[PDB]
Amino acid sequence: QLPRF
Amino acid sequence: QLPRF
Amino acid sequence: AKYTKEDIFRFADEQNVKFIRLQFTDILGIIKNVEIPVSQLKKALDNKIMFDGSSIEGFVRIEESDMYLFPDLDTWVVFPWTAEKGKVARMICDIYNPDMTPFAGDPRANLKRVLKEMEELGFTEFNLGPEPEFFLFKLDENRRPTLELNDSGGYFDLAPTDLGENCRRDIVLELEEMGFEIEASHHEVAPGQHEIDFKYEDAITACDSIQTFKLVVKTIARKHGLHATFMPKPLFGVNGSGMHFNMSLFNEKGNAFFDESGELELSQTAYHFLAGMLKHARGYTAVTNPTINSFKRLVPGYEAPCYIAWSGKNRSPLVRVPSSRGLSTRLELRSVDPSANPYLAMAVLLKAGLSGIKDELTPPAPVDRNIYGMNEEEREATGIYDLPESLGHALIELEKNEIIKDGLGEHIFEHFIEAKTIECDMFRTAVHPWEREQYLEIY
Amino acid sequence: AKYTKEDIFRFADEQNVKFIRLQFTDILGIIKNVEIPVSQLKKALDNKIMFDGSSIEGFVRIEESDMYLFPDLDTWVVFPWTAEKGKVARMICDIYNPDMTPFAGDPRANLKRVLKEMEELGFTEFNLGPEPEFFLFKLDENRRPTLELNDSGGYFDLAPTDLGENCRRDIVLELEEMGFEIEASHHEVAPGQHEIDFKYEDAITACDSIQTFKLVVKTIARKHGLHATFMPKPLFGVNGSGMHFNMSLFNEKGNAFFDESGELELSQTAYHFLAGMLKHARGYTAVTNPTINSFKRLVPGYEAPCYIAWSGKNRSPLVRVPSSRGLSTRLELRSVDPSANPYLAMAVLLKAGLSGIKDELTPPAPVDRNIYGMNEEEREATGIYDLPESLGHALIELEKNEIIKDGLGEHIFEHFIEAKTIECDMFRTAVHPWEREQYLEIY
Ligand SMILES: NC(=O)CC[C@H](N)C(=O)O
Ligand SMILES: NC(=O)CC[C@H](N)C(=O)O
Ligand SMILES: [Mg+2]
Numbered sequence: 001q002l003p004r005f
Numbered sequence: 006q007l008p009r010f
Numbered sequence: 011a012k013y014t015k016e017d018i019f020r021f022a023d024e025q026n027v028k029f030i031r032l033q034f035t036d037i038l039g040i041i042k043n044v045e046i047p048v049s050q051l052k053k054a055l056d057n058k059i060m061f062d063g064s065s066i067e068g069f070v071r072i073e074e075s076d077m078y079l080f081p082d083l084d085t086w087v088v089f090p091w092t093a094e095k096g097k098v099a100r101m102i103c104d105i106y107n108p109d110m111t112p113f114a115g116d117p118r119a120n121l122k123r124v125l126k127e128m129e130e131l132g133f134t135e136f137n138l139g140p141e142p143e144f145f146l147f148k149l150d151e152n153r154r155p156t157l158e159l160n161d162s163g164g165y166f167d168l169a170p171t172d173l174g175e176n177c178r179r180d181i182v183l184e185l186e187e188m189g190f191e192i193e194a195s196h197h198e199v200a201p202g203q204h205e206i207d208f209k210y211e212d213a214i215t216a217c218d219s220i221q222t223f224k225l226v227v228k229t230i231a232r233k234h235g236l237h238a239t240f241m242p243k244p245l246f247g248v249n250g251s252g253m254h255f256n257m258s259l260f261n262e263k264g265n266a267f268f269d270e271s272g273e274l275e276l277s278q279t280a281y282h283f284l285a286g287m288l289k290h291a292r293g294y295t296a297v298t299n300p301t302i303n304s305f306k307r308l309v310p311g312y313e314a315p316c317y318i319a320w321s322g323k324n325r326s327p328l329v330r331v332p333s334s335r336g337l338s339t340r341l342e343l344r345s346v347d348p349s350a351n352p353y354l355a356m357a358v359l360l361k362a363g364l365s366g367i368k369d370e371l372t373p374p375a376p377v378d379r380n381i382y383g384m385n386e387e388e389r390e391a392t393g394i395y396d397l398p399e400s401l402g403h404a405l406i407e408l409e410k411n412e413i414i415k416d417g418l419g420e421h422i423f424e425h426f427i428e429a430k431t432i433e434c435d436m437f438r439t440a441v442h443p444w445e446r447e448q449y450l451e452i453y
Numbered sequence: 454a455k456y457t458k459e460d461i462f463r464f465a466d467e468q469n470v471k472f473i474r475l476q477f478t479d480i481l482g483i484i485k486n487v488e489i490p491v492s493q494l495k496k497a498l499d500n501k502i503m504f505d506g507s508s509i510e511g512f513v514r515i516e517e518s519d520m521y522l523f524p525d526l527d528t529w530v531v532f533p534w535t536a537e538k539g540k541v542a543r544m545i546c547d548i549y550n551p552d553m554t555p556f557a558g559d560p561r562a563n564l565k566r567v568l569k570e571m572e573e574l575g576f577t578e579f580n581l582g583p584e585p586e587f588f589l590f591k592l593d594e595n596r597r598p599t600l601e602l603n604d605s606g607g608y609f610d611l612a613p614t615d616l617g618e619n620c621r622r623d624i625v626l627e628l629e630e631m632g633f634e635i636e637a638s639h640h641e642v643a644p645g646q647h648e649i650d651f652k653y654e655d656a657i658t659a660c661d662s663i664q665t666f667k668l669v670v671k672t673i674a675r676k677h678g679l680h681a682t683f684m685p686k687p688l689f690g691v692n693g694s695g696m697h698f699n700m701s702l703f704n705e706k707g708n709a710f711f712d713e714s715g716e717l718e719l720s721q722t723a724y725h726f727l728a729g730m731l732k733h734a735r736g737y738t739a740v741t742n743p744t745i746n747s748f749k750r751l752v753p754g755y756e757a758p759c760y761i762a763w764s765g766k767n768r769s770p771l772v773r774v775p776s777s778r779g780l781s782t783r784l785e786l787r788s789v790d791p792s793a794n795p796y797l798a799m800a801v802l803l804k805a806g807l808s809g810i811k812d813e814l815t816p817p818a819p820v821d822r823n824i825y826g827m828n829e830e831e832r833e834a835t836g837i838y839d840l841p842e843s844l845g846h847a848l849i850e851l852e853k854n855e856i857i858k859d860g861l862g863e864h865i866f867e868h869f870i871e872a873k874t875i876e877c878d879m880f881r882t883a884v885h886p887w888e889r890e891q892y893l894e895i896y
């Protein structure tokens with residue numbers, strides 16, 4: 001869902 | 006127009 | 011139908027390939043692929059390969075979903091840089107649901123759906139010619155990109171010259187060998203910036219060629235100890251990189267944009283397409299410029315477009331009409347950058363043009379008075395409007411416009427909005443060295 | 454007609470060329486080019502290649518303009534330094550408007566127009582022989598030019614000698630191999646300064662040979678770890694580099710400048726040409742010396758011209774009449790430097806000579822009394838006048854003179870004036886280390 005963050 | 010200046 | 015299954019099997023046997031990269035493009039534009047041995051090739055041609063479709067959603071994927079990998083036979087290309095331990099070939103694949111239905115979240119399938127709508131309205135094909143520009147940087151000792159350009163060239167200058175190097179020359183030669191239709195290749199305004207032009211093909215073929223061109227250019231630049239980047243604005247105060255799209259619409263008779271008896275030798279279809287493209291430009295600006303850095307390119311003084319206007323000859327217009335006519339009649343959109351997903355950009359542009367044709371909108375009068383001369387207030391009185399200045403404003407404009415949502419599809423629209431909002435939030439809360447250089451000592 | 458389309462196709466097939474550089478010259482004199490694969494060669498020979506004509510305007514370009522790329526078949530040259538992965542060939546191209554009309558802003562087209570005017574007046578050809586001089590500098594570890602000359606030679610001295618090196622010998626050998634008509638080659642007065650002389654050809658062919666010679670010399674010097682520069686005055690207190698032009702005018706009978714029954718064995722046409730050249734010298738001095746550094750060469754004591762006068766034998770005259778007669782009768786202008794654009798210089802010189810012939814002006818008496826002996830006031834009483842001492846004064850003289858404007862054309866004149874005024878303003882506001890060395894400690 002949120003690997004970037 | 007002015008990439009030198 | 012250029013190739014059949016038997017042709018593919020014969021090619022695999024005769025060129026001695028042992029690896030096949032079944033590749034596709036996700037929402038964000040990153041090229042992804044599943045790698046299979048040649049022994050599975052038959053199964054690959056039976057449309058029986060399963061994979062995780064959620065990867066198409068990018069990093070915002072949540073739940074694993076099984077999907078098929080319908081390949082395209084006409085996209086069979088054998089890579090030359092494969093040594094002798096078996097060669098590597100690729101085929102762009104379509105994504106299908108387990109119920110034998112094309113996936114709505116696949117950009118290529120969405121583009122095919124939009125093309126089907128266009129054919130339903132009465133047209134035959136949508137020819138596109140892109141003009142991608144890229145920067146070349148020197149690598150470091152640890153094979154990491156640096157900020158030093160490969161040459162201090164100029165616009166159309168004979169800067170790389172002969173006697174070795176000339177990465178551009180080497181690249182176009184290998185592209186010609188691989189089976190690419192290259193029209194021309196020259197040096198761009200910025201130092202270390204080069205532009206290679208393509209021949210005009212169909213929408214899907216043009217997008218596939220764009221992706222393959224990016225991959226091949228990056229690989230060849232890495233071969234010669236260079237880093238090829240398609241960032242819209244890698245450096246400040248220097249010209250950015252653009253991917254101008256020259257689009258033409260065809261019918262049974264011929265070019266639909268050409269009319270010898272019309273004003274500017276342009277048909278009413280061309281004017282309706284212009285009106286549709288200009289009306290929704292604020293809408294699809296987010297899709298055509300999907301990165302934070304993209305809007306750093308859209309600044310005045312670097313020939314990038316900044317206002318919604320069209321002209322035949324002007325300093326950086328949003329839409330430009332080339333002087334060529336006949337079968338070469340086309341409309342050029344200059345706001346697109348190499349970072350954009352070709353399939354999504356083509357889908358939204360085709361949807362806007364089709365809506366303009368259906369509504370028979372009248373385009374605004376062309377501007378040729380150097381709109382940059384006046385202030386924002388002095389030109390807002392007329393039909394001249396500003397493009398969104400940040401990715402957040404462009405996202406808001408996307409969320410407002412409905413035709414672009416219809417052209418993207420619900421799945422793609424939702425996932426694109428989620429990813430771009432995450433990107434904007436990540437950029438907004440970061441602390442950059444600019445802020446420290448401006449306030450650490452003063453305050 | 455030396456070559457045809459079929460000849461070009463046969464050459465491309467037999468020499469195995471995969472790249473063609475369609476090249477041209479901008480206003481500033483920089484050689485620019487568009488690079489196309491051999492597969493597009495047929496289209497290139499159909500005069501169907503489009504490109505951005507605004508690049509001809511140089512850095513002062515504003516709006517993109519589409520223009521055709523009519524190539525010249527007689528200029529087909531295959532480069533030898535191309536390895537084995539396909540050879541590279543070039544053809545100088547003409548620039549044409551989309552309405553099938555030659556571009557007025559192209560220096561080559563302007564020279565062709567001036568030659569058409571000359572043919573209308575009754576003459577056949579304008580033969581030119583240039584005498585370019587260049588400096589050779591040693592490269593650094595990072596392949597950057599240094600201030601160290603390659604040899605401490607002398608005028609006509611056997612300085613480079615045998616046993617390796619002798620870059621002048623290698624350059625002339627490769628030029629002969631490439632198909633250049635080289636008359637002689639020698640060492641100039643300054644250390645590291647060399648001159649190579651050409652055979653006398655037509656105006657257009659001579660200018661093309663000049664551009665190709667510059668390119669080839671630079672490439673070959675870079676091959677041997679040297680930097681070849683055509684700057685008019687790279688160093689202070691040393692002789693500068695010149696590009697003396699020996700011009701002759703021909704008619705149906707033969708040489709128009711030769712008359713056995715005339716004074717000095719010169720025809721009345723030659724005297725009218727001299728009068729025209731001397732009358733407008735203050736006008737075209739800007740075109741013949743277009744750089745700031747150029748006027749650093751035009752200083753007394755280094756054999757460069759400084760006064761508007763002509764002689765058969767004198768210390769640095771503006772115009773010199775060589776002793777050779779018959780078909781070799783010619784007038785030599787010595788104020789031209791290698792930095793000048795050959796096409797513009799030839800156009801303005803031909804316009805001045807043609808105006809002198811039409812007006813039948815009487816030239817002033819030649820001076821042979823060492824005009825350098827007297828002061829400025831003592832020689833201003835006679836017809837001796839000073840050349841402009843700076844690029845700004847030369848620009849003012851251009852803006853005053855009308856015949857040179859007619860010979861340049863409105864487009865070229867305006868863009869040249871704009872670029873040169875920008876250059877002058879950029880140089881004027883700069884702070885040089887000379888100023889710091891002279892005032893930082895004193896004041
Ligand atoms: N000369 C040009 O048109 C270059 C335009 C600029 N490189 C861009 O990205 O838009
Ligand atoms: N010996 C000579 O005539 C050289 C002249 C000088 N090099 C010049 O450029 O004018
Ligand atoms: Mg470009």
Ligand SMILES: [Mg+2]
Nearest residue numbers: 141254342344
């Ligand atoms: Mg363009």
Ligand SMILES: [Mg+2]
Nearest residue numbers: 584586641648
């Ligand atoms: Mg000399």
Ligand SMILES: [Mg+2]
Nearest residue numbers: 584697785787
């Ligand atoms: Mg001489």
